[PDB]
Amino acid sequence: DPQLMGSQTTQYSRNRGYGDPIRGDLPIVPDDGGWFATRANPAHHLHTGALSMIGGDASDCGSTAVQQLIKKYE
Amino acid sequence: PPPPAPSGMQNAYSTHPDAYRTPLLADSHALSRMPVVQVHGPQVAPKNSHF
Amino acid sequence: CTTGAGVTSGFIDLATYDNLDRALYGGKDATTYFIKEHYPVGWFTKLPTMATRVSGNPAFGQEFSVGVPRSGDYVLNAWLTLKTPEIKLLETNRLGANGTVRWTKNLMHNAVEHASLTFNDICAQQFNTAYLDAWTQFNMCEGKRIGYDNMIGNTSDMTNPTPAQGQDGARTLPSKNLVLPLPFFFSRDCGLALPTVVLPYNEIRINIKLRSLQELLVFQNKDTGNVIPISATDIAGGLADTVEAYVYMTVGLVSNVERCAMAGTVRDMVVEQMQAAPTHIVNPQNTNNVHVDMRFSHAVKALFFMVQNVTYKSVGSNYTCVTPVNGPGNTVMEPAMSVDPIKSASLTYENTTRLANMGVEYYSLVQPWYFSASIPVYTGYHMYSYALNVGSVHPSGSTNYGRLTNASITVTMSPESVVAAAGGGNNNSGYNEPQRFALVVIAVNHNVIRIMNGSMGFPIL
Amino acid sequence: TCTTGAGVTSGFIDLATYDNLDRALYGGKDATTYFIKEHYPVGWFTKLPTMATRVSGNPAFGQEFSVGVPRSGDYVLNAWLTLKTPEIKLLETNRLGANGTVRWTKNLMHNAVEHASLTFNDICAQQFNTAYLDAWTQFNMCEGKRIGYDNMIGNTSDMTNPTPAQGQDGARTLPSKNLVLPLPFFFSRDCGLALPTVVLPYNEIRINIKLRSLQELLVFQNKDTGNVIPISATDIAGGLADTVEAYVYMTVGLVSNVERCAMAGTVRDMVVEQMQAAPTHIVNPQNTNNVHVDMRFSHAVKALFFMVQNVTYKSVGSNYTCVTPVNGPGNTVMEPAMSVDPIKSASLTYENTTRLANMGVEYYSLVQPWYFSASIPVYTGYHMYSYALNVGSVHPSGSTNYGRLTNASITVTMSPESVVAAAGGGNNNSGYNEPQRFALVVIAVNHNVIRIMNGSMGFPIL
Amino acid sequence: TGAGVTSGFIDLATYDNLDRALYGGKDATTYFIKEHYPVGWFTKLPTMATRVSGNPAFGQEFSVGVPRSGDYVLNAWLTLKTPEIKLLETNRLGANGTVRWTKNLMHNAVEHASLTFNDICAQQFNTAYLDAWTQFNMCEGKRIGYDNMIGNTSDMTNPTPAQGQDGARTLPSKNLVLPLPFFFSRDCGLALPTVVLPYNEIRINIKLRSLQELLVFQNKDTGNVIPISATDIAGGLADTVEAYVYMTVGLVSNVERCAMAGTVRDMVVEQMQAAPTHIVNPQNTNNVHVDMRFSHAVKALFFMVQNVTYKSVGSNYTCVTPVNGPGNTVMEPAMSVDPIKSASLTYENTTRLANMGVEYYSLVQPWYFSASIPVYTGYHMYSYALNVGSVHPSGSTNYGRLTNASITVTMSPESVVAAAGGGNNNSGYNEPQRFALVVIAVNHNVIRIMNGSMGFPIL
């Protein structure tokens, strides 16, 4: 068990880093076929995005609490 | 057989029973001449204890 | 009443108390001064050792390796001592009476490049002149500045030009040994030390490639300020290639109970590495804007850059736009017009201006003032730190360029550098000959090293 | 020669020597050890400078302008001001003719900035000025950055070097180089204290900066008699440009969304440091050599900084000695020999119950900075007395609340050098050729508490 | 133009395994938030120390009692007004004669500075320890201030010619301040519990040095030094002079002064052990070995060879005495190197430290295990601890149970050639030179406070 590449992630696809940074790439399942079908792995083919990586839909802020706060205060 | 044991007192003795020679060294102070090495001191009574 | 040796004066302050003082001080669990909590620490000892040479011979322009000694529980300090030769100028020099010889500025950090540390045959890290200069200019605590500027040369004797024997100045450059510490990950902090007891068979090497002595001495003309390479016939005694260079490392021993407790486990450390971008050649006559792409892998922490004057290969550690000249009193001086070639630098992240066209004074002063332990005293040495404290070994704000898209550093040239690139300058002006510049970029990044079963490696890589 | 030694095994004697004192000091089941550093995770964030949207007028010498702190940042923890000085070119048509030199005053920065304030909504929250800036930069300056500061704030041996008229040997022009002043504030003092603009959406944060007039910024000096007179527009070429470009930059630091939403909707308490400047008092050593000044301070004071400032000429600033600087050889400013701090002794009294006796001036000058500060001034004046163990430490230390204290007094006794400098008649190139005037300025530094709740900031003690 | 805001979102988007290992986590200590904890209530103020014996005079000794009725004593310093020197025209040297204050006026005229508890001595320090500690643990920014406090103003030390010569200036009379390094002054956490020690009487004994050796009388041309006399200068030699001692006293709240009453306490303090100086003659032999006899766990060793040719000049650790220079300014001639070339430590005839170079102790050891590097020749050190200035214990060894050890030094060609005179004018070695090797040790100790009394449990 060499330690030079033990806990090392695989080299990501070149197209992963070209996606939208603000909004993560949409989750689409690939084609696990054998006739002009790409066997892309979403583990290293999809960019999670800046906001989707951390979340945003918390119990208090939840990215939408402002709407019902305004509705209640109105 | 593997290479000799690395330094740091793992190579200062042999595992075979007929030659061990515990790495401890005897003191040079003998027994007749034992230095006092350590002594104890008492608390000093205050100068103005008469008040 | 109030008399000498009074104590009642402070009773007014003691009685002074309100809600603000109750909020700040006081409380059942509040700590107090004048009382120090004492806790036991580990039992250990330390001592220096001489590292026996194992490869090559110490000589200028060649590479030699030194093996790290065993039998020490930890090693946390390493330095190189070198005995400089004796310089004696002769009247048979090519420049005649109008010739002077002196050691280059910053004798140490020179004659030492590609200084590498290898575990078995794995290059853990490597540093060179640019990194040494940047580190010693940015993270040098005061009080030790004089000591460092004395041990690395720069004693106003090596850098003072001396004329030939026939002239008034017939002094010879003294031959005194100089000491240069080796900045390594284990030397950064006492909490990070190499477990040589854990690694009894993983042999460790330090590779040092010295620089040739021809490009260590500056042969400066007195009047026109022209520098030409030195030769054996120029000075008496020739140029002895061999040199007396030795390596010393400080080792430490711990208690038997501590050693047996620590032996037999996996240990993870956070270390700092350097990545130097490939050098670039800048011609201000052609274009006034220079862009260099950065390629880095791990989480970078700071970016150091400067434009180095490469007009004369003998003179080094000169990041100004004009080479130094020989002034009065057998000393070296910087001419009137000598400023950093940088005017404004900016960062671009794939056609996105992450950092605007900030002025050169920003990187020169504001960034070191807030996010560094010192401010450089020489022109150049511009920096940008993603972390609050660069010198802190503990991790701080940092970005991984390996997972980031292409980034470009953009620099605008200065009119002083533009006019200095073309020659025509008068005598003792530095820019008499046409001047060429080079741009160098270095970065410091974080990394994780794992030690397990008497072996080393980089799990992330 | 002969450098072999026993080797690594020599330390085994040091390890073997072990007594009861060594057992009490080192060792133990829970005893900590070096060579191993514990690692703990920290938060995820990124920082970057941003422009500040100024929405009030344009910068100009002798005018006041306000810049609004930009929102959209989780935390702001820095603030500095950049200003590009104009170009100076003296003309032969000056009033003094050949004996006329022009130079920027000492400490170009910390000047042209007075009553710099940071207000929230419409409440006066903080304020500082030239005396506080000078005292802080002289008392709490980390070594190594001193050269950088003295290069970015002026005093770079180029602005302060007098230049004669064009017809004389010295015809150089003062360079027009931009300078940077880092504005001290409670959020800029430490990284642990930052303004939570993310949870402060109901408040307006503004910074007010009032620049000085270029007439008093510049210094016009007589080469022979060493007299200072106000400058005029016709004296220098190109006139006087009242308007000038100036910008306020600040660093914005973000934070992870999980921590942001965790800290959202909670009551926050912060400790900040403010200052109070007592009104200046005119001192005339000709009449009396002893001056007593009352103090009126409100909160828990941490330290008192004072100094007597020479105020003979309003053009020259940051001068706290008895004799104004005069021109010297080599077109460089020269300090006349008879130039010492006018204060000879000082004392503090709490309603006829004195706390400090008639201590010597050297006490406040040297002993107090040596023990209860991070630096020692390299100039004259700048006396301090600190109730706290460490002035620079943001954490509270020993202090006294002046609000719950009756009026206190400070007494200063001047010096024979000051009383003889008060009268004029000095010879040429001596500074005191004309009568000298001095003023007393007192600055105090105090702690305060700031409460953050319901998206607003305010003092819970009023 | 730029982008400003929203530029950092693409930066925050980058997150990998290394970033997850370093940052992140539910227990990560975020910045921008400071945890505040309350502290104790106290108030400090200065206080005169009342003299109890003797009279302050040069060449005498006087003792001052520590003021009582306090809670903590955490400072101590002395102030002394230097006399005014009026050089006369009837001096022995005639026109070719100058008078100046010795270099490092403070740390001179103060020797055997002792602090005693009740009737037993507790600590003692002197000139060599003061100079070494100041040169090795001087925080920058305060270096100029401390220099100004102790003198070295280029006015006291600048030579002044006779009245009729070009230089008519005289040495001004201004007071100087010397802090007293003590265990309670090392850190604020260690202070004398005066509230815990009632009816205990504490002494500070200071012995001054006579004015004959505090004044340097240098020949203008040949650079010779002769002892001064009262008739040589105007105003005589006033032996008596003022000298005051101040110290800071702190007061604490009743809730803690009553709480801490009647409790046993143990404190770790740093003391000084000085081996007797040894005269060294480089003319006969080049190697000088001196034994070291110490008791407790030593932390650091300092040593130096002092030029002792003229008792008038002090703090001279160079083989060549300073001479008068151009511009009425004292200068040190070109031949100026430390006489020590190499040093080694021997443990029971076992060389723990080999024949290391002098530059090692001069530069490498201070660079790693000290807060400062000396700016003057000499002052060699070797420390067993990682940080000398840290009050907290570090690596150290005890000499009480360690059998006799020695330290050996080797001389230098410059020292052996300067030991014999014959040099030209202003060469410094115009007369034969004598040297004395001095070694100081800084160690640890434990002091026990109980029952309103103080003592040393380990003795």
Short mmCIF file of C-alpha atoms in Angstrom, two decimals, chain E residues 219-365:
data_model
loop_
_atom_site.label_atom_id
_atom_site.label_comp_id
_atom_site.label_asym_id
_atom_site.label_seq_id
_atom_site.Cartn_x
_atom_site.Cartn_y
_atom_site.Cartn_z
CA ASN E 219 45.92 60.32 25.47
CA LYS E 220 45.05 62.23 22.32
CA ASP E 221 47.77 60.79 20.07
CA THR E 222 49.36 57.62 21.50
CA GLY E 223 46.08 56.25 22.89
CA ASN E 224 47.28 55.57 26.44
CA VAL E 225 45.06 55.37 29.52
CA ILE E 226 46.07 56.54 33.00
CA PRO E 227 43.95 56.72 36.18
CA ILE E 228 42.19 60.01 36.82
CA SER E 229 42.77 62.27 39.83
CA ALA E 230 40.68 64.86 41.64
CA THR E 231 43.07 67.70 40.76
CA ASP E 232 43.01 66.71 37.07
CA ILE E 233 39.48 68.10 36.60
CA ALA E 234 37.59 71.05 38.03
CA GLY E 235 35.02 70.58 40.77
CA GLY E 236 36.80 67.65 42.37
CA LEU E 237 35.36 64.14 42.64
CA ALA E 238 32.13 64.28 44.65
CA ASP E 239 31.89 60.75 46.05
CA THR E 240 28.32 61.22 47.29
CA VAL E 241 25.48 61.36 44.77
CA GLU E 242 21.73 60.81 44.73
CA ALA E 243 20.26 57.42 43.85
CA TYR E 244 16.58 56.50 44.01
CA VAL E 245 14.83 53.14 43.67
CA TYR E 246 11.28 52.78 42.35
CA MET E 247 9.06 49.74 41.99
CA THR E 248 5.53 48.99 40.80
CA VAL E 249 3.00 47.71 43.33
CA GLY E 250 -0.33 46.11 42.45
CA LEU E 251 -3.60 45.82 44.37
CA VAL E 252 -6.24 43.12 43.96
CA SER E 253 -9.83 42.58 45.05
CA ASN E 254 -10.82 41.35 48.50
CA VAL E 255 -12.67 38.37 47.00
CA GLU E 256 -9.32 36.99 45.84
CA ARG E 257 -6.98 38.33 48.54
CA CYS E 258 -9.06 36.44 51.12
CA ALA E 259 -9.43 33.40 48.85
CA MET E 260 -5.68 32.94 48.33
CA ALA E 261 -4.84 33.34 52.03
CA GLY E 262 -3.39 30.31 53.79
CA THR E 263 -2.38 28.30 50.71
CA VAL E 264 0.94 26.66 49.88
CA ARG E 265 2.46 27.78 46.57
CA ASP E 266 5.46 26.70 44.50
CA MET E 267 7.11 29.00 41.96
CA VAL E 268 9.78 28.28 39.34
CA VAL E 269 12.42 31.02 39.14
CA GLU E 270 15.64 31.62 37.22
CA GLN E 271 18.87 32.33 39.11
CA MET E 272 22.50 32.99 38.16
CA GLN E 273 25.67 31.02 38.89
CA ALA E 274 29.00 32.64 38.00
CA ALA E 275 32.29 30.76 37.96
CA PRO E 276 35.36 32.74 39.05
CA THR E 277 37.16 34.54 36.25
CA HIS E 278 40.52 33.17 35.11
CA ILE E 279 43.47 35.22 33.87
CA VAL E 280 44.61 34.04 30.43
CA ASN E 281 48.10 34.58 28.99
CA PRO E 282 48.16 33.78 25.25
CA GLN E 283 51.94 34.35 25.21
CA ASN E 284 52.63 31.09 27.07
CA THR E 285 49.80 28.74 26.05
CA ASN E 286 46.95 28.79 23.54
CA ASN E 287 44.47 26.39 25.18
CA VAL E 288 42.63 27.39 28.37
CA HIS E 289 40.39 24.88 30.14
CA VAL E 290 38.26 25.82 33.15
CA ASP E 291 36.06 23.55 35.26
CA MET E 292 32.38 24.30 35.80
CA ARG E 293 30.72 23.75 39.18
CA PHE E 294 26.96 24.35 39.22
CA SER E 295 24.12 23.01 41.35
CA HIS E 296 20.65 23.16 39.78
CA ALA E 297 19.20 22.51 36.31
CA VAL E 298 21.15 24.90 34.10
CA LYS E 299 19.40 26.38 31.06
CA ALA E 300 22.07 28.41 29.27
CA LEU E 301 25.79 29.16 29.34
CA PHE E 302 27.36 32.48 28.38
CA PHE E 303 31.06 33.23 28.19
CA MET E 304 33.52 35.82 26.95
CA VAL E 305 37.14 36.93 27.26
CA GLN E 306 37.40 40.49 28.56
CA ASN E 307 40.36 42.79 27.97
CA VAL E 308 41.44 43.84 31.47
CA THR E 309 44.49 45.95 30.65
CA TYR E 310 43.04 49.16 32.12
CA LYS E 311 40.48 49.00 34.91
CA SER E 312 39.23 52.43 33.80
CA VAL E 313 37.73 51.08 30.56
CA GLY E 314 34.93 48.54 30.90
CA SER E 315 32.82 46.23 28.74
CA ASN E 316 35.78 45.66 26.40
CA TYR E 317 35.63 42.11 25.02
CA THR E 318 38.03 42.78 22.13
CA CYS E 319 41.77 42.17 21.92
CA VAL E 320 42.39 45.86 21.11
CA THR E 321 41.36 48.72 23.38
CA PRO E 322 39.40 51.59 21.79
CA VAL E 323 41.37 54.69 20.85
CA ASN E 324 40.54 58.30 20.05
CA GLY E 325 39.36 58.85 16.49
CA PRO E 326 38.85 61.75 14.09
CA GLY E 327 36.14 64.28 14.80
CA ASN E 328 36.42 63.93 18.60
CA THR E 329 34.61 60.58 18.32
CA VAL E 330 35.82 57.32 19.86
CA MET E 331 36.72 54.69 17.27
CA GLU E 332 37.75 51.05 17.44
CA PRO E 333 40.92 50.33 15.38
CA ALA E 334 40.87 48.02 12.37
CA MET E 335 42.41 45.09 14.27
CA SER E 336 39.23 44.13 16.12
CA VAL E 337 38.32 40.45 16.50
CA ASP E 338 37.15 38.33 19.40
CA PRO E 339 40.15 36.53 20.95
CA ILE E 340 38.27 33.21 21.05
CA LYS E 341 38.79 30.97 18.02
CA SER E 342 37.13 27.72 19.13
CA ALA E 343 35.50 26.19 22.19
CA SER E 344 34.42 22.76 23.39
CA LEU E 345 32.66 21.11 26.32
CA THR E 346 34.07 18.07 28.14
CA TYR E 347 32.00 15.74 30.33
CA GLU E 348 34.22 13.60 32.59
CA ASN E 349 36.75 13.40 29.75
CA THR E 350 34.02 12.85 27.15
CA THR E 351 33.70 15.54 24.48
CA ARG E 352 29.97 16.23 24.26
CA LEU E 353 30.57 19.26 22.01
CA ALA E 354 33.45 19.06 19.56
CA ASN E 355 35.89 21.84 18.73
CA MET E 356 33.22 24.03 17.14
CA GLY E 357 34.13 27.33 15.54
CA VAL E 358 33.62 30.59 17.39
CA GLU E 359 31.23 31.83 14.69
CA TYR E 360 28.93 28.94 15.62
CA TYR E 361 28.32 30.21 19.15
CA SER E 362 28.42 33.79 17.85
CA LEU E 363 25.68 33.50 15.21
CA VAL E 364 24.03 30.09 14.79
CA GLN E 365 22.99 29.53 18.40
#
